[PDB]
Write a protein that binds this ligand. Structure first.
Ligand SMILES: NC(=O)C1=CN([C@@H]2O[C@H](COP(=O)(O)OP(=O)(O)OC[C@H]3O[C@@H](n4cnc5c(N)ncnc54)[C@H](OP(=O)(O)O)[C@@H]3O)[C@@H](O)[C@H]2O)C=CC1
Ligand SMILES: NC(=O)C1=CN([C@@H]2O[C@H](COP(=O)(O)OP(=O)(O)OC[C@H]3O[C@@H](n4cnc5c(N)ncnc54)[C@H](OP(=O)(O)O)[C@@H]3O)[C@@H](O)[C@H]2O)C=CC1
Ligand SMILES: CN(Cc1cnc2nc(N)nc(N)c2n1)c1ccc(C(=O)N[C@@H](CCC(=O)O)C(=O)O)cc1
Ligand SMILES: CN(Cc1cnc2nc(N)nc(N)c2n1)c1ccc(C(=O)N[C@@H](CCC(=O)O)C(=O)O)cc1
Ligand SMILES: NC(=O)c1ccc(C(=O)O)c(NC(=O)c2ccc(Cc3c[nH]c4nc(N)[nH]c(=O)c34)cc2)c1
Ligand SMILES: NC(=O)c1ccc(C(=O)O)c(NC(=O)c2ccc(Cc3c[nH]c4nc(N)[nH]c(=O)c34)cc2)c1
Ligand SMILES: O=c1[nH]c(=O)n([C@H]2C[C@H](O)[C@@H](COP(=O)(O)O)O2)cc1F
Ligand SMILES: O=c1[nH]c(=O)n([C@H]2C[C@H](O)[C@@H](COP(=O)(O)O)O2)cc1F
Lengths: 505, 506
């Protein structure tokens, strides 16, 4: 009685694993993972057994795998005894004799074959599942990994990795002291909200995304879903300037890798083009909302209407003249603002240009900072800056990381946009300055969920995350303002359906 | 064979537990903790046994404790059989008969007596220790808890709690003698190098981890600082900076501290709290004259305000200690045209602090309570660009004031404890002026680094197990935030480890 694990690499949506007798992809790291997971053993005087079908045995050239024993399921292959590293059985059931006798076999791996997978899961021989989720779906398959039965639950989901612009994930499925916890519970019974742990309660299972993954929430999309869960658990019900009240907490953070993937949420289709258009609108220094409306981007329409402007005391302002906001403090900080039609070339401090110059002239400098919080101009703005401050860091291996402090975070609408936007901005700065993308950390003050999003976000929490996509630039620009939407290629983005959520004005 | 736990409340330094036959303090929550930990059982048809000495039995009025069975060790008390809730034994060894027979006893607690504690530890009967550390040392004791033997290791240390301005901690000591996920993660980290982000944030090795036996119970929020030190020592890249002293640096970290039940002043090192207050009130008043700090015997800004340093950074025209428009000039006169430190700036610039107070007490649920010091127009005029760059403030529904701080650059040896204590004091001042209670303090850090001439010192600091945080109280309620004086601050129950000298990088 020992352990049996399926090892498979399947596509993310349709679970395709093969085409015309070979693999539909070439990922070296996935083969290295197969090797290390099938060689992983405890007793040096024992070997592991790798069960595979006959066509799979043909796929690997009919040659043995070093240090392991291959078990081929075939009804026609001659039961040869010459090779002690390869043995043939007439059916999968008889081949499980590695359990009964043969104490020199430590662990068993079901290594390939749609038929082998299917009748190993149907016969309930499988204890564990090592699944490599590959983000390739618009290709041809003829062999599929069967659907994982409900008796299995996921216990691990790795970060997204990238090979040849292909995103992939690693997941584990499993078939399914107290004294410290008791003392903490007693202290939390004695002290009420006086104990800070009671103010940061762990989210209940009903609001926790994929709860069976307890210790292996490595995929960095969990940094967003778990913040959603924390707000749902501990969020105080509070009113704000809009008619829609929120559930709010104060002081949170999220980390995202940008070396091996692009942090665009997969549990919901995100409008990446509107994000890019808003970001390039910021970079060019523009505050004219009509330039966004003309490009079919309407995210600033609510905060730039005649009624809203007259209500907040800017009735003199033109229709979509948002005032000195993001991109006017970026390029013309402390500049005397008049209208959106005037020429501001030369006035104010160009934070972006000085930032680029310092990033490529003094990388280890600790002052790479871009701010939008200008107390002298807050009254002239249609909306004070939400993503308030950002800092940039050049690693010793020439990667560019970004920190963002955001004073107020609409988790339903604003947060995915902010994640993708500052990811794109860090990538642009890295290309312009000759670096690679690093990490993205977002520090949040008032993180809140609007009450008219509760149905939506909870729905989003029911969807198990998929591996992040990749984002590449088609050309190397000479100035950061020259980026165009056609220059951006989004590779391997297979999200869940769109979740409509109304904005609070 | 069942579990045996000592339960004791002792002072933080000398381990005093009694005086003149009674307790040297009155902490209700600690008695409630004793009750809940001695009543905690699994079988409803069983009871717990509480072993105590005879003088201890006199201290509690010689009356039984509800739902439990008291075991009194005495050589003269009559072995009465009338009370089934109290039983007497002639020695501690015979009283351990609860193990051999009496299956109605689930757990055993050694509940008091210096002699009982001492010969229960000497006889090696004790499995666990529940210790309440009380921060009271300048009083008289006649009864002490014996030294914890080396066979015990701490596994839990709670946050600091406050009762009647007295700080205390809860700790657990234990006597000592799935893997699939870990193996898969290790294999992925072998395949991918620094390509796997986990390998860029490696868990600190035991040799640089403060009190390593506390694995799952690092609740004391001083661990938020020591663990950041450890993370920098583990993953910090060796980097040069504008000073001659290189650092080990990482990017993107955070620390949380409670301010409702304690004051986050580090205990693993004696911190100059007076200099912190003086610098903070110097900021609040709008002052940029370093001589005003030097006159009060505070020399933290001398290095960045010398004639040589000013001439070196291009401010040779500037007077000796004229630091320029820095912290407290952007607070009170933001975007104001700076001349010298002697001129009158009353009215010029934006008074961020005043508007912050007005908005905090007029619109508490507003999401724009922000104080910034990063002014790109004035960076060149500053003797040093702002480190604690931006701060935001939040009013909870229960009328508490919490603070978030983004800090672009963090000297963990010198600057970080000062920043923690300083923004704690500032949040408390704002809370008193606006009529709230102190809440939480979160610090978000960009370049968190350790200067290489601090490595020995901080390592020394990492060898010291943290003590409970002290309390900080104000003696009077001021009418304006600028009226705070050093005499107005009372620091109660601060018993730190000795000072660790560390030189500043200019
Ligand atoms: N992405 C991944 O992880 C993997 C992908 N693949 C891909 O999948 C494809 C091959 O898999 P697949 O098409 O399913 O072929 P198989 O690997 O399952 O091999 C099938 C053969 O196994 C024997 N066999 C299967 N079931 C039985 C049974 N119940 N009794 C007796 N013999 C049996 C038969 O051999 P016989 O005809 O001699 O009787 C059968 O022809 C290839 O493209 C391969 O590259 C393969 C492995 C892993
Ligand atoms: N902070 C805390 O957690 C606690 C503090 N305390 C404090 O400590 C003080 C009292 O404790 P303490 O002074 O140590 O007195 P004790 O509680 O240890 O009681 C001592 C008595 O126990 C009996 N005894 C002890 N050892 C033996 C033995 N080997 N054989 C027979 N009898 C024995 C003797 O009783 P006899 O003379 O009858 O033979 C002895 O006089 C009080 O101030 C109390 O408030 C008490 C409990 C807990
Ligand atoms: C059966 N098969 C197809 C194949 C391809 N990718 C997979 N990926 C996964 N996650 N799981 C599988 N079962 C799997 N199977 C295989 C099996 C082994 C090798 C192989 O060459 N293995 C070498 C790998 C050498 C190296 O890259 O280090 C080894 O030593 O195990 C190739 C294809
Ligand atoms: C022996 N003793 C002194 C005393 C005081 N503080 C301590 N604190 C600790 N952590 N551990 C001790 N052994 C301890 N002992 C005691 C024991 C019980 C009670 C007592 O009144 N217990 C009630 C608690 C009453 C309450 O609700 O406050 C109970 O139900 O157990 C008081 C003093
Ligand atoms: N289903 C989806 O998740 C989804 C699909 C499509 C879009 C799309 O715009 O294409 C979308 N995003 C928005 O509507 C949207 C709107 C505005 C801002 C930024 C902002 C400016 N002022 C704001 N004031 C408040 N209260 N809150 C905000 O967020 C913003 C960011 C995003 C969401
Ligand atoms: N560690 C101890 O035990 C200890 C004991 C006593 C004192 C004391 O001054 O009494 C002390 N603090 C300082 O020396 C000190 C000095 C300066 C600043 C702020 C600052 C301004 N410019 C800085 N440039 C750099 N690189 N780094 C800084 O921190 C600062 C804060 C603190 C530490
Ligand atoms: O980039 C943005 N990110 C964001 O989260 N908001 C949300 C935050 C808040 O829910 C709302 C307005 O913030 P406040 O009402 O505090 O002024 O806009 C707006 C943006 F433009
Ligand atoms: O309040 C302060 N906090 C702080 O951490 N420093 C340290 C951070 C850094 O080690 C040094 C100079 O920062 P920088 O070289 O990035 O300008 O001052 C200075 C302060 F005044």
């Amino acid at each position: 009685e020992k352990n049996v694990s399926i090892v498979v690499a399947a596509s993310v949506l349709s679970s395709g694993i093969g085409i015309n007798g070979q693999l539909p992809w070439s990922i070296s790291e996935d083969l290295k993972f197969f090797s290390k997971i099938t060689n992983n053993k405890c007793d040096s005087n024992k070997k592991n057994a790798l069960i595979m079908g006959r066509k799979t045995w043909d796929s690997i050239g009919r040659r043995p795998l070093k240090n392991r024993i291959i078990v081929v399921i075939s009804s026609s292959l001659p039961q040869d005894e010459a090779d002690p590293n390869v043995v043939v059985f007439r059916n999968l059931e008889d081949s499980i004799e590695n359990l009964m006798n043969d104490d020199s076999i430590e662990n068993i791996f079901v290594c390939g074959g749609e038929s082998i997978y299917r009748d190993a899961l149907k016969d309930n021989f499988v204890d564990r599942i090592y699944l490599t989720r590959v983000a390739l779906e618009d290709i041809e398959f003829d062999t599929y990994f069967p659907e994982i039965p409900e008796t299995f639950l996921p216990v691990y989901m790795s970060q997204t990795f990238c090979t040849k612009n292909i995103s992939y994930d690693f997941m584990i499925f499993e078939k399914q002291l107290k004294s410290i916890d008791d003392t903490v519970d007693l202290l939390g019974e004695i002290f009420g909200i006086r104990k800070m742990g009671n103010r940061h309660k762990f989210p209940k299972e009903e609001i926790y995304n994929t709860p069976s993954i307890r210790f292996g929430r490595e995929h960095y999309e969990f940094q967003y879903l778990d913040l959603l869960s924390r707000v749902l658990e501990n969020g105080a019900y509070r009113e704000n300037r809009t008619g829609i009240s929120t559930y709010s907490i104060f002081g949170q953070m999220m980390r995202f890798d940008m070396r091996e993937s692009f942090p665009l949420l997969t549990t919901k289709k995100v409008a990446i083009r509107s994000i890019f258009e808003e970001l390039i609108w910021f970079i060019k220094g523009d505050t004219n909302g009509n330039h966004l409306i003309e490009k079919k981007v309407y995210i600033w329409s609510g905060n730039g209407s005649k009624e809203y402007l007259e209500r907040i005391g800017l009735g003199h302002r033109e229709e979509n003249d948002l005032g000195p906001i993001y991109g006017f403090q970026w390029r013309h900080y402390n500049g005397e603002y008049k209208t959106m039609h005037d020429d501001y070339t030369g006035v104010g401090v160009d934070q972006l240009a000085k930032l680029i110059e310092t990033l490529k002239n003094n990388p280890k400098d600790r002052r790479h900072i871009l701010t939008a919080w200008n107390p002298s101009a807050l009254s002239q703005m249609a909306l004070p800056p939400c993503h308030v401050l950002s800092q940039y860091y050049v690693t010793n291996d020439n990667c560019l990381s970004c920190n963002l402090y955001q004073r107020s975070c609409d988790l339903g609408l604003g947060s995915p946009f902010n994640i993708a936007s500052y990811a794109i901005l860090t990538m642009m700065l890295a290309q312009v300055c000759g670096y690679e993308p690093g990490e993205l950390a977002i520090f949040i003050g008032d993180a809140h969920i609007y009450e008219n999003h509760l149905t939506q976000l909870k729905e989003q929490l029911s969807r198990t995350p998929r591996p992040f996509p990749q984002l590449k630039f088609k050309r190397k620009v000479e100035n950061i303002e020259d980026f165009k939407w056609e220059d951006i290629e989004l590779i391997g983005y297979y999200p869940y359906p769109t979740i409509k959520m109304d904005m609070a004005v």
